[PDB]
From a paper:
Toll-like Receptor 3 (TLR3) plays a key role in anti-viral defenses by inducing a potent immune response against double-stranded RNAs (dsRNAs) produced by viral infection. Previous crystallographic studies show that RNA ligand binds to the extracellular domains of TLR3 and induces the formation of a homodimer of TLR326. The ligand-binding site involves both the N and C-terminal parts of the TLR3 ectodomain.
To study the cooperativity of the clustering, we titrated the ratio of ectoTLR3 molecules against the number of available binding sites in the poly(I:C). In the subsequent 2D classification analysis, the number of the TLR3 particles in the cluster was estimated to be 50% of those in the dimeric state. In a close inspection of the micrographs, we found that almost all of the particles bound to the straight double-helical part of the dsRNA are in the clustered state. The vast majority of TLR3 not in the clustered state is located either where the TLR3 clusters ended or where the RNA strands make irregular kinks. This observation demonstrates that clustering is a dominant feature for TLR3 when bound to RNAs with regular double-helical structures.
Numbering used by the authors:
A (entry chain B), B (entry chain A): 29 to 687
Write the structure that this text describes.
Amino acid sequence: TVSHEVADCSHLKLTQVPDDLPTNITVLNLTHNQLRRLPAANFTRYSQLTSLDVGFNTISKLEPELCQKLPMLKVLNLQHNELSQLSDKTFAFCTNLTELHLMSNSIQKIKNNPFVKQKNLITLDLSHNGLSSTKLGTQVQLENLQELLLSNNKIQALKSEELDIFANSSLKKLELSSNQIKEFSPGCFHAIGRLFGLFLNNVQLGPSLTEKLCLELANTSIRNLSLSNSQLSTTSNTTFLGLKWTNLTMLDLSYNNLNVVGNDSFAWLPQLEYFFLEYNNIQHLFSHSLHGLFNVRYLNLKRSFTKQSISLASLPKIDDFSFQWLKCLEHLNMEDNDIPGIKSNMFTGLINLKYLSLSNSFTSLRTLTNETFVSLAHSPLHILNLTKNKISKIESDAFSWLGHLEVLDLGLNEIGQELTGQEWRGLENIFEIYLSYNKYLQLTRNSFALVPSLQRLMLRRVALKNVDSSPSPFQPLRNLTILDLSNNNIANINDDMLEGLEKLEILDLQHNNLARLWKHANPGGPIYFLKGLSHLHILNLESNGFDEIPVEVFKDLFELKIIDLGLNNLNTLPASVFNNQVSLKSLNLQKNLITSVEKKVFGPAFRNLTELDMRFNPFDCTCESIAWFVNWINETHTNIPELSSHYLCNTPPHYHGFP
Amino acid sequence: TVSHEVADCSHLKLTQVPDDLPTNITVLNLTHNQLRRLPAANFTRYSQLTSLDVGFNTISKLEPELCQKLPMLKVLNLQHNELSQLSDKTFAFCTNLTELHLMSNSIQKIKNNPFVKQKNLITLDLSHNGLSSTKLGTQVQLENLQELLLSNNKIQALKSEELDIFANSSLKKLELSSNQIKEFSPGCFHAIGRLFGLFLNNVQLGPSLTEKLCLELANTSIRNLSLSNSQLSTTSNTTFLGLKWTNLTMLDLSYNNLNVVGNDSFAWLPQLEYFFLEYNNIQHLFSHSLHGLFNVRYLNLKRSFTKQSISLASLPKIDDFSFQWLKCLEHLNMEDNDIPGIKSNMFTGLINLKYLSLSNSFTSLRTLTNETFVSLAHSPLHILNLTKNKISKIESDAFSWLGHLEVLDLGLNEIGQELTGQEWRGLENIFEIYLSYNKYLQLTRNSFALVPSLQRLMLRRVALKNVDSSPSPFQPLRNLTILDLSNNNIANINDDMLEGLEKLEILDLQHNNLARLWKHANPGGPIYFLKGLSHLHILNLESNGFDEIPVEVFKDLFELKIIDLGLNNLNTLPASVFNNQVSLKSLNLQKNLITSVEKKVFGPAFRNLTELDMRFNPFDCTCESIAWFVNWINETHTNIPELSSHYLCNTPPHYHGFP
RNA sequence: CCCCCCCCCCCCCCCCCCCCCCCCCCCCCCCCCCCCCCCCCCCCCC
Ligand SMILES: *[C@@H]1O[C@H](CO)[C@@H](O[C@@H]2O[C@H](CO)[C@@H](O[C@@H]3O[C@H](CO[C@@H]4O[C@H](CO)[C@@H](O)[C@H](O)[C@@H]4O)[C@@H](O)[C@H](O)[C@@H]3O)[C@H](O)[C@H]2NC(C)=O)[C@H](O)[C@H]1NC(C)=O
Ligand SMILES: *[C@@H]1O[C@H](CO)[C@@H](O[C@@H]2O[C@H](CO)[C@@H](O[C@@H]3O[C@H](CO[C@@H]4O[C@H](CO)[C@@H](O)[C@H](O)[C@@H]4O)[C@@H](O)[C@H](O)[C@@H]3O)[C@H](O)[C@H]2NC(C)=O)[C@H](O)[C@H]1NC(C)=O
Ligand SMILES: *[C@@H]1O[C@H](CO)[C@@H](O[C@@H]2O[C@H](CO)[C@@H](O)[C@H](O)[C@H]2NC(C)=O)[C@H](O)[C@H]1NC(C)=O
Ligand SMILES: *[C@@H]1O[C@H](CO)[C@@H](O[C@@H]2O[C@H](CO)[C@@H](O)[C@H](O)[C@H]2NC(C)=O)[C@H](O)[C@H]1NC(C)=O
Ligand SMILES: *[C@@H]1O[C@H](CO)[C@@H](O[C@@H]2O[C@H](CO)[C@@H](O)[C@H](O)[C@H]2NC(C)=O)[C@H](O)[C@H]1NC(C)=O
Ligand SMILES: *[C@@H]1O[C@H](CO)[C@@H](O[C@@H]2O[C@H](CO)[C@@H](O)[C@H](O)[C@H]2NC(C)=O)[C@H](O)[C@H]1NC(C)=O
Ligand SMILES: *[C@@H]1O[C@H](CO)[C@@H](O[C@@H]2O[C@H](CO)[C@@H](O)[C@H](O)[C@H]2NC(C)=O)[C@H](O)[C@H]1NC(C)=O
Ligand SMILES: *[C@@H]1O[C@H](CO)[C@@H](O[C@@H]2O[C@H](CO)[C@@H](O)[C@H](O)[C@H]2NC(C)=O)[C@H](O)[C@H]1NC(C)=O
Ligand SMILES: *[C@@H]1O[C@H](CO)[C@@H](O[C@@H]2O[C@H](CO)[C@@H](O)[C@H](O)[C@H]2NC(C)=O)[C@H](O)[C@H]1NC(C)=O
Ligand SMILES: *[C@@H]1O[C@H](CO)[C@@H](O[C@@H]2O[C@H](CO)[C@@H](O)[C@H](O)[C@H]2NC(C)=O)[C@H](O)[C@H]1NC(C)=O
Ligand SMILES: *[C@@H]1O[C@H](CO)[C@@H](O)[C@H](O)[C@H]1NC(C)=O
Ligand SMILES: *[C@@H]1O[C@H](CO)[C@@H](O)[C@H](O)[C@H]1NC(C)=O
Ligand SMILES: *[C@@H]1O[C@H](CO)[C@@H](O)[C@H](O)[C@H]1NC(C)=O
Ligand SMILES: *[C@@H]1O[C@H](CO)[C@@H](O)[C@H](O)[C@H]1NC(C)=O
Ligand SMILES: *[C@@H]1O[C@H](CO)[C@@H](O)[C@H](O)[C@H]1NC(C)=O
Ligand SMILES: *[C@@H]1O[C@H](CO)[C@@H](O)[C@H](O)[C@H]1NC(C)=O
Ligand SMILES: *[C@@H]1O[C@H](CO)[C@@H](O)[C@H](O)[C@H]1NC(C)=O
Ligand SMILES: *[C@@H]1O[C@H](CO)[C@@H](O)[C@H](O)[C@H]1NC(C)=O
Ligand SMILES: *[C@@H]1O[C@H](CO)[C@@H](O)[C@H](O)[C@H]1NC(C)=O
Ligand SMILES: *[C@@H]1O[C@H](CO)[C@@H](O)[C@H](O)[C@H]1NC(C)=O
């Protein structure tokens, strides 16, 4: 029963409440216990409780005396119990409750008036019960109740009389999910004082019943209406007629298996702002299908279209000018679809668009012709996502229409070509370009000469070729900050590749082959490709096969903080190498061949750190080579994980395995 | 000028012969020098010479006084000189010479009688000279001359008169290669006393001139006749008519670009025993093409047939019963051909065949149907070679016709299947089966149950699968001696896999993954799969990833001599492991992680060796761990290559790199 | 001045083989999570 300010007793197998706790405890948690009964006589000591979570237990019934001992209780949680009987005196003395959870209590019928005696209630939960009617009392009560949950019940109708108790209550959420509701009575929602949101997820309504619901929702204050998994196979221009008289803003139609969308179906939602259509089975989107939605600010179409079938090749076709109506659209999530391709008028009319996602949106967008993004000429796009589209070639002037583009995501594709440099023309405001996980890229002298504003360039596992050109391909990128060149099997790097990139901060070169470039036997001398990077912060050089470190590689990294050198073949290091790393924070040298840690090399590096990773190193336990290191280990504040588990000497055999 | 019994002065840039050598020297070699002249006055000291190789020098002329100082000279070599003038007195005093080389001396014309004064000459060489006629004198001499070489000369005719000097000489070899001979005179070869072999390689004869040659060779004692690269495009039944009256045994027709072979072409060679046809362009072999060769004991057909061409797909077709005439054939080398496949009557009639080679003989022999080798039912084959035939499947009873087969070579193929065990039925006398470098093989319990007589089984780089069956697939192979299982990436081995193989001698398991089977943390205990191999001699366990050696793995290898354990991860070894290796000869532990060599483990192993390979090991220079080893290195007779080059300690840094 | 034969030496090209390092893929084994399922035991409600 650990407790400092709140009390936790979760999964402690308690049968009776403890009697030894501070009197001024505010939260008392007893989830996942076996409390058969809860006598109130044991709550005399606990008279300052605010939250009482006694859920997931086996309480049969409660007593009104429990509330007497708690004068200021605000939360009462009784999830997954056997409290199937309620009375007027059950919640009589409790009047400050702002939360009441009764989920999965097997409550069958609300008898007379269990909730009359409280007026400050905010949230009421009745999910997973055996209730058949939404009647919670006779007179009007629950003045401040804002959220009412009735999901997973056995309610088959919504009669007008049963909601007469909410004539003056502002319901912000009426959860009625998973209830086989098949009849709606007139005035059922008009009787509710102020209904702001309705949720009918997993409710088998159907199109005709959906139209009846919308008609019953006319001239009300609804703002949200979730109809997920409602088996809404087909919509028409009259399905949402009843919403013409309201101001609905959020509509959810996900998982409805919507086979087709009718012409002018959504013309009755001029105030819609958030529209959801993910995980549907739409086979054809008409030009006027999305008519009347000129105020939508966020449209989701993830898996909204039909998948390809070898039987018929029923690829979902999107007609031209289909998105011309979404004037105020600002976010289009359109991932995991099977569209044949982009047309010249597919995205016409989106004059306020700022985010377009096309991750795996097309079956085969092999070539990015310069006319592909012509429909996005007037769209002020900022972020474009094109991952997993199996793109194989990008022609010149492909992105010449996206003048406002800032983030381009071309990773996880099959782009194999030579970057002539003309592919990035027109990206005058580009900031980040992602190209990782491609087939193979061949850089040129002027590959990135047309995008001087670039700041991020990720090229992880792309099999870079001709990166060792005499003019550095990264020279025009004066504002570059993050560069990733990992898992490219790079062999040769020139010393002037990173020349002029003063603002570079994060550089990744792990999982490459640069061992030869740093050995003293390399013809032409070791390559010092890390000079001038005065603002470098994070350096990664894992699995490079390094066997020797030149003395003056880190001579100018005055602001280096994180350096990674694990999975290398380092055995000895030059003396006085980390002198300029005055602000180093994390040093990683795991899975190396280092046998000696001396002050002459690791002195300045161990000045003020916060992490250290030298786990799988064959240390040599000798006072000449490890004594300073173990003495430093003894007194320090640096975090060294697995210090006593893997920091084991290998030689001499006398100290073989001794930490 | 190193010399103990013979004198060598090759490539020493001598200008004059040395005057300080033992008097009783028998061989005096001066090849590749710059001896402008060779005065005989310097040979007074050297009067016991038998061989005098002064070739590849710049001697202009010699003097008869040179022979006077040498009474017993037998070899006179003058290759690549400028001795273009010969006289009767040049070789007068020299009479014991049994060898005389005059290659590339730019000799223009033999004037009168340069070789009369000797009668014991055996071999005479005159290659790469400017001679235009084969006249070497006027009268008859050279009684004992057996070999005469005249290759690469400028002889354009073979007149009868020019060979009148060999009326009583037995010529075993008359080399006339690379001479543009275009006319043969009657009686040219009949004038020669006893001609046994003629060589006309690289001589542009042609079919009509070949027939004229054969007619001129009638009723003579020739036995060999090499006509390689003679531009013999076509043969007919009359090309070799002139050989009907002789007893020719060896005939060479290689590189002749023989496009077609005529019907009954070789019916005139009943005594032929060695026939060569390699590197030809035969497009079709007729049934009666090889008629009359019922005495051939060795036929070579390597690249004898035309290669495939995409223009016409002119695959060389071999008619049925084409080899029916070779009754006494015993060796058929038939590699590197483009035959479409094997037929039911391709090899019929070979009742004495004992060696058939079909390495890369067919373009695509994908499936080995049980009817493929039906033509070899009565052939007493012993060795069959089927490498690089791109064989993809072997059906049951494929080798049911080869009852006398002993060696089967199926390696370097693409055989991917499951060895049900019925493929080896009928191999009652099989000894060796080669299957290395295949696609993938899946062994079964009774894979080799039908060939208990097997002794060799090579399975290198075949990706063995299901080798860890509960019954050992090698159990029926009671007489197995050599087993190769390298580069198969084998993971799991049962301890009874090699049970009962007492006669096993050589076992290869390198380049596999058996590290887990020997660690003490392996569930079920370490696998001791080397028990009962009392006759094991060679063991290979390279690149297995071993990290720990069980103590009693080599407890029964009483006759082990060569053990390989290089490229492993061994760091420590159990004490008293090599006790039973009383006859160990070579121990290989290179490229390991061993840091300590102690008498407790390497004592018995270093008893009496002949080789040791521990080059790339990070030894720990400490008197507790290396002192015994270095003391043993000091005094020993074992061969330790690169002892002072790679046996360098890694730790402590004081001894870093010191041998 | 031309045509050739040798000695020595330095580059260049092709192929074979070996070694170091690395990448990708795959196999074997282990571990950490997530979901689902089955069984045993205890405690309650109807
Ligand atoms: C363009 O769209 C694509 C696709 O939507 C975006 O890719 C997404 O990028 C984010 C950020 O990198 C990814 O989130 C990551 O999720 C991984 C999940 O790994 C988990 O690891 C735990 C470990 O226990 C496992 O148990 C889990 O099962 C799981 O494997 C997480 O490790 C990362 O830290 C990170 O949060 C996201 O997954 C990825 N989407 C897809 C489909 O791959 C891309 O960012 C976007 N471009 C832009 C510019 O926004
Ligand atoms: C069925 O026929 C096949 C094909 O004729 C036979 O395969 C032959 O097998 C022999 C013996 O294994 C091979 O000889 C080997 O040749 C290699 C050559 O390697 C060399 O290495 C030097 C190293 O400096 C290089 O310079 C050279 O260039 C060359 O690469 C040699 O290393 C071995 O020691 C061995 O002598 C032969 O090459 C091989 N033939 C072919 C075409 O691969 C096969 O034996 C035969 N089956 C039976 C049962 O006879
Ligand atoms: C939906 O929104 C419209 C526009 O905001 C509301 O119409 C206004 O309502 C307010 C409050 O009753 C009136 O003061 C305005 O005069 C109305 N303007 C117009 C042009 O009608 C409408 O009431 C909202 N719907 C509901 C059900 O409240
Ligand atoms: C109607 O739905 C919208 C969209 O789900 C809700 O807006 C989000 O609400 C969640 C829950 O409070 C927040 O976490 C998000 O930040 C909201 N998004 C935005 C863009 O504001 C909205 O609250 C719902 N309205 C009602 C009355 O339930
Ligand atoms: C919704 O509007 C679109 C746009 O007009 C309709 O598409 C037309 O369908 C007819 C009938 O096949 C075609 O002849 C026209 O060529 C289509 N128009 C265009 C621009 O291609 C669509 O039919 C309408 N929906 C319904 C249900 O009628
Ligand atoms: C690289 O970044 C710098 C700094 O963000 C950019 O310089 C700014 O340019 C704008 C517009 O010309 C000026 O208003 C700012 O005053 C500049 N900042 C400074 C500190 O001088 C520069 O334009 C960027 N380079 C590119 C090619 O976009
Ligand atoms: C080729 O071989 C045959 C058979 O060996 C030779 O014929 C024999 O020659 C010897 C020697 O002259 C005689 O004694 C035999 O009587 C011959 N027998 C027959 C059946 O003819 C023949 O001479 C050989 N060819 C040459 C050119 O010598
Ligand atoms: C005729 O040719 C055959 C085949 O080349 C010769 O027999 C081989 O001769 C070489 C050279 O002496 C030997 O190394 C081989 O061992 C011989 N092979 C066999 C099977 O004996 C034969 O010597 C040649 N005959 C003449 C007279 O030159
Ligand atoms: C050499 O003998 C073979 C075997 O008879 C001849 O092959 C025959 O060729 C004729 C003409 O095309 C065909 O009609 C026969 O069917 C072939 N025989 C067989 C058994 O297939 C071959 O023609 C002869 N060589 C020459 C030059 O005539
Ligand atoms: C395995 O090898 C042994 C020895 O070579 C074979 O035993 C010989 O068999 C022959 C024929 O039956 C006998 O004449 C020998 O006396 C046997 N030798 C010994 C030492 O007993 C045995 O047959 C071979 N196994 C197979 C299946 O062929
Ligand atoms: C509750 O309902 C009564 C009767 O309609 C009404 O007078 C009162 O204003 C309502 N409560 C609130 C807080 O509006
Ligand atoms: C559906 O469209 C038709 C065609 O204009 C129209 O007559 C009808 O009124 C629409 N449905 C509703 C419910 O308005
Ligand atoms: C680039 O776009 C223009 C305008 O559509 C077009 O005329 C031209 O052919 C395109 N270039 C290429 C290489 O396709
Ligand atoms: C060194 O690290 C400690 C611990 O995080 C921190 O308190 C101190 O300020 C650091 N010193 C400097 C100069 O940053
Ligand atoms: C350092 O050593 C002292 C003396 O043994 C010990 O008291 C102290 O706990 C050690 N510090 C750490 C972090 O272990
Ligand atoms: C040399 O030729 C003569 C004349 O024909 C002959 O008598 C003599 O026997 C021959 N020499 C030998 C060794 O046969
Ligand atoms: C070639 O064959 C024909 C047909 O039998 C025959 O008449 C002729 O004699 C043969 N040639 C020779 C040189 O015998
Ligand atoms: C095996 O050979 C016999 C005889 O030619 C044939 O009848 C049978 O079909 C062959 N078996 C298979 C599986 O082809
Ligand atoms: C040990 O090796 C030496 C050297 O080869 C050899 O002379 C000697 O006979 C060997 N001893 C035995 C018992 O084989
Ligand atoms: C062994 O050491 C002795 C003493 O230094 C030396 O004379 C002898 O040459 C050494 N043996 C070898 C094989 O180097």
